[PDB]
UniProtKB/Swiss-Prot annotation:
This is Receptor-type tyrosine-protein phosphatase S. It comes from Homo sapiens. A cleavage occurs, separating the extracellular domain from the transmembrane segment. This process called 'ectodomain shedding' is thought to be involved in receptor desensitization, signal transduction and/or membrane localization. Residues 40-44 are annotated as: Important for binding to glycosaminoglycan chains. It is found in: Cell membrane; Cell projection, Axon; Perikaryon; Cytoplasmic vesicle, Secretory vesicle, Synaptic vesicle membrane. Residues 5-95, 107-196 form the Ig-like C2-type domain. Cell surface receptor that binds to glycosaminoglycans, including chondroitin sulfate proteoglycans and heparan sulfate proteoglycan. Binding to chondroitin sulfate and heparan sulfate proteoglycans has opposite effects on PTPRS oligomerization and regulation of neurite outgrowth. Contributes to the inhibition of neurite and axonal outgrowth by chondroitin sulfate proteoglycans, also after nerve transection. Plays a role in stimulating neurite outgrowth in response to the heparan sulfate proteoglycan GPC2. Belongs to the protein-tyrosine phosphatase family. Receptor class 2A subfamily. Coiled coil: none annotated. Disulfide bonds join C26-C79, C128-C179.
Amino acid sequence: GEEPPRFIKEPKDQIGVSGGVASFVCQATGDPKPRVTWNKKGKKVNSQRFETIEFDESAGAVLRIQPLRTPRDENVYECVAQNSVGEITVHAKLTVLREDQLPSGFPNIDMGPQLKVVERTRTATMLCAASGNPDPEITWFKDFLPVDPSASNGRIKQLRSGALQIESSEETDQGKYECVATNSAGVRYSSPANLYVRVR
Ligand SMILES: [Cl-]
Ligand code: NA
């Protein structure tokens, strides 16, 4: 009844903007079920601008850096997965550009999401118009954690337009949403938008 840890979600190198945000996502499995931790050069990652959000019983961890500082935050970071029969490591590098030195094709948020208010049970759609070259792929974060529409059992859909849609809004859907535009050139976060649900 034992299996060493293995990464099922590995963090990727990122290129962010000064003042913006970067989130590295790391997740592992194994038996016993492992914990994952974020470190830098062996030391635990934890400061005012560096927060970790654990999920999946701590077998998952998001490292959110905000606001980004250059060149302070330009480093390699480590996600360490550990259980009783193994400890493994994956690396993710962070690059931080000044707004001044952004390449022309760097993702830009033409129109980010706004404060959303919706009557419980009704559909709420939050828009995100992003530009870039290549055309950025759009993802969303809720309360610092990545949203996964496909794993939402149909409660949440990402539209072809990049918009996030809640099919039948419940109180649980309230929170702080951010859209993220990512391409070969780097990553840019929209300003956050809160979603509030009002009584039916
Ligand atoms: Cl919107
Ligand atoms: Na990542």
